[PDB]
Amino acid sequence: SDPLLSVLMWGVNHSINELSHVQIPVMLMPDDFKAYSKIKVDNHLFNKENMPSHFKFKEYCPMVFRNLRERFGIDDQDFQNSLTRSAPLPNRFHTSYDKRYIIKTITSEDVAEMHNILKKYHQYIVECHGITLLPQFLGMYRLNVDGVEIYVIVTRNVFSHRLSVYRKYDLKGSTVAREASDKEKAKELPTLKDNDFINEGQKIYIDDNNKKVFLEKLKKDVEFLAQLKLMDYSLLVGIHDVERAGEFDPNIDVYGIKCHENSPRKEVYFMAIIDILTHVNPEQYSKRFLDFIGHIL
Amino acid sequence: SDPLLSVLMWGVNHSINELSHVQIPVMLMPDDFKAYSKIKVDNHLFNKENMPSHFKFKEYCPMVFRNLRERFGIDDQDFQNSLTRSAPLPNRFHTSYDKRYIIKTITSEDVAEMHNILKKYHQYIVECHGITLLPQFLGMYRLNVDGVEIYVIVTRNVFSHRLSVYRKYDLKGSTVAREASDKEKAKELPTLKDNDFINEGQKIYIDDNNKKVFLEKLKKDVEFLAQLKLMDYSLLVGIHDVERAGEFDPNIDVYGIKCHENSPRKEVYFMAIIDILTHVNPEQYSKRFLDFIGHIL
Numbered sequence: 001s002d003p004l005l006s007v008l009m010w011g012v013n014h015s016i017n018e019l020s021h022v023q024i025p026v027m028l029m030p031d032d033f034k035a036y037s038k039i040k041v042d043n044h045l046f047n048k049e050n051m052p053s054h055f056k057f058k059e060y061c062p063m064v065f066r067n068l069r070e071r072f073g074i075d076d077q078d079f080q081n082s083l084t085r086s087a088p089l090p091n092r093f094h095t096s097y098d099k100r101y102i103i104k105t106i107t108s109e110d111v112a113e114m115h116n117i118l119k120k121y122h123q124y125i126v127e128c129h130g131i132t133l134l135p136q137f138l139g140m141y142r143l144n145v146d147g148v149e150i151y152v153i154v155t156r157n158v159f160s161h162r163l164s165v166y167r168k169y170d171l172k173g174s175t176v177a178r179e180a181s182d183k184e185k186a187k188e189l190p191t192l193k194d195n196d197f198i199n200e201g202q203k204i205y206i207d208d209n210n211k212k213v214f215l216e217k218l219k220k221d222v223e224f225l226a227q228l229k230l231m232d233y234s235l236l237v238g239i240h241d242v243e244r245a246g247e248f249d250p251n252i253d254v255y256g257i258k259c260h261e262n263s264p265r266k267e268v269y270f271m272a273i274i275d276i277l278t279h280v281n282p283e284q285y286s287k288r289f290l291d292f293i294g295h296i297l
Numbered sequence: 298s299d300p301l302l303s304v305l306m307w308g309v310n311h312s313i314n315e316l317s318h319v320q321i322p323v324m325l326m327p328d329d330f331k332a333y334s335k336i337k338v339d340n341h342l343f344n345k346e347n348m349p350s351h352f353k354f355k356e357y358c359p360m361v362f363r364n365l366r367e368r369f370g371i372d373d374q375d376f377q378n379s380l381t382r383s384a385p386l387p388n389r390f391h392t393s394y395d396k397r398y399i400i401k402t403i404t405s406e407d408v409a410e411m412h413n414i415l416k417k418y419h420q421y422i423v424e425c426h427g428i429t430l431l432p433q434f435l436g437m438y439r440l441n442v443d444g445v446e447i448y449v450i451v452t453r454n455v456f457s458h459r460l461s462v463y464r465k466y467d468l469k470g471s472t473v474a475r476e477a478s479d480k481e482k483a484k485e486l487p488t489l490k491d492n493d494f495i496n497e498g499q500k501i502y503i504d505d506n507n508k509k510v511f512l513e514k515l516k517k518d519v520e521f522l523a524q525l526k527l528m529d530y531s532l533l534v535g536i537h538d539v540e541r542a543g544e545f546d547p548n549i550d551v552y553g554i555k556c557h558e559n560s561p562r563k564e565v566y567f568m569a570i571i572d573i574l575t576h577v578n579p580e581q582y583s584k585r586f587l588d589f590i591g592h593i594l
């Protein structure tokens with residue numbers, strides 16, 4: 001009874017069904033990056049209980065996002081199920097009922113930026129064999145329900161689908177002060193920021209190897225982002241306390257890192273980059289971002 | 298690679314999938330008779346191998362035809378399979394790959410006439426509990442593929458889906474002479490007419506009970522048709538010779554009648570009304586049709 005949501009589920013369902021009939025080659029062609037499919041639905045005096053009467057669904061570059069899903073080790077049928085077997089839950093983003101995917105509303109500006117970087121982004125994912133801390137983009141759509149038009153993007157959840165998170169940080173490593181809201185603090189899991197970290201002595205206990213890998217990854221990802229003139233992105237950090245609610249599937253919870261053996265508490269960390277689509281400058285912003293994360297880890 | 302056909306299969310598939318999610322009540326409402334659903338599809342640089350790039354599919358009164366299918370003992374999933382698991386074959390009509398259904402192209406005039414009689418037709422099917430020799434109408438659609446627009450209707454095949462037919466008649470019982478074509482005679486199974494019957498001494502060997510039932514049915518059906526100002530319909534007659542290519546399923550081959558015990562050859566007969574949608578007069582045409590069939594049976 002959120003009509004936009006049901007158009008989305010209807011849309012995702014339809015999309016994966018269509019693709020199931022398409023022969024998938026190993027390569028994308030340049031045209032695949034300029035492609036889309038539109039479906040306009042008009043129901044007159046029919047099917048009122050489920051669908052809206054007049055709606056639209058547009059999918060951008062279905063072949064590119066098909067290719068990306070598989071490269072991120074996501075199967076189309078599983079993806080469909082996660083988005084359609086039961087509604088996504090709100091909170092401003094939605095998360096799939098099974099906590100695997102994030103569904104964020106974006107602007108037409110963002111859609112244009114995505115289209116602008118999609119080839120280079122795709123090529124990046126090829127080179128690093130899908131091993132990255134960048135947002136994993138899984139699908140991009142336009143929804144129309146009688147007058148209202150929204151754009152959405154789908155990504156992999158940085159947090160675990162099983163193991164709960166008792167503390168979140170959103171780090172940018174900026175010179176201007178960043179601190180969390182008192183209004184947000186009241187919510188079950190607040191969204192702490194650079195100084196809630198730098199102030200309240202938060203430590204991330206990972207071993208020297210896990211840290212070396214992570215920072216090497218982070219370095220390449222961030223340089224790629226700067227080179228695209230992208231900035232204002234964050235590192236999302238999630239802490240799972242084993243001794244409250246802790247063995248994860250690193251093939252589903254791909255962003256997990258176990259704490260080292262001498263850690264004060266049994267912890268799992270979930271860390272990746274989020275919010276890349278905004279296009280003082282990009283170049284130094286990345287270095288300033290990389291300096292910060294080095295210091296806190 | 299007949300694009301209109303693939304739009305039809307695509308369309309039928311989509312339609313039954315949508316309906317599978319609709320809660321079906323025991324009754325139709327008046328609005329159900331005025332209802333439709335349109336789907337417009339635009340593929341830009343995508344999915345070229347299967348679907349056309351720009352197509353439309355409109356289904357008339359989906360709830361009415363859903364109700365009719367079930368009343369004719371056809372399950373939606375089976376119906377979908379018959380129309381979609383493999384292409385329909387031509388010959389001007391198409392027949393489903395499994396020989397269960399006929400797909401005929403009709404005019405917008407015919408579609409308007411169907412809409413005009415649909416409530417009364419439906420009510421008729423309720424009263425006779427679906428036991429009739431009338432065309433069983435299972436679905437009605439509009440297809441658009443880049444410029445061309447066709448209307449189709451789907452019916453149950455009068456002939457058997459298993460047992461072959463070596464002789465067909467098309468009887469109207471008209472005063473003006475009717476005889477088959479020499480050009481058609483050359484084809485494997487010609488389409489004989491009133492005088493090919495009345496001339497070449499053709500007999501239909503059914504027992505006095507089967508004949509009584511049939512004619513009683515035929516009487517009600519035909520009166521109903523006349524009362525709707527419909528005429529120019531025919532009795533399609535199909536003879537299966539057991540001793541050439543004969544036990545049928547009367548729940549799939551619903552129009553079958555076994556020959557009586559003293560019949561010169563082991564025969565099965567398939568007889569029903571076809572071609573009702575044309576709107577010297579209707580009233581006597583029916584009586585003249587009923588006179589004829591009485592005499593030949």
Ligand SMILES: CC(C)CCN1c2nc(Nc3cc(F)c(O)c(F)c3)ncc2N(C)C(=O)[C@H]1C
Nearest residue numbers: 102104135136155156157158159273274275276
């Ligand atoms: C709200 C903002 C700051 C985060 C939005 N965001 C993401 N969010 C999550 N999971 C997530 C889960 C939570 F339980 C939660 O409280 C939270 F804050 C975030 N995964 C991936 C992304 N990716 C890749 C992103 O680009 C953007 C879209």
Ligand SMILES: CC(C)CCN1c2nc(Nc3cc(F)c(O)c(F)c3)ncc2N(C)C(=O)[C@H]1C
Nearest residue numbers: 399401432433452453454455456570571572573
């Ligand atoms: C071509 C004309 C005269 C028949 C078309 N027709 C039907 N045809 C068939 N099966 C059929 C099968 C054959 F193998 C065949 O050679 C043939 F002639 C007809 N069943 C039901 C209908 N119904 C109900 C009809 O209203 C109309 C649409």
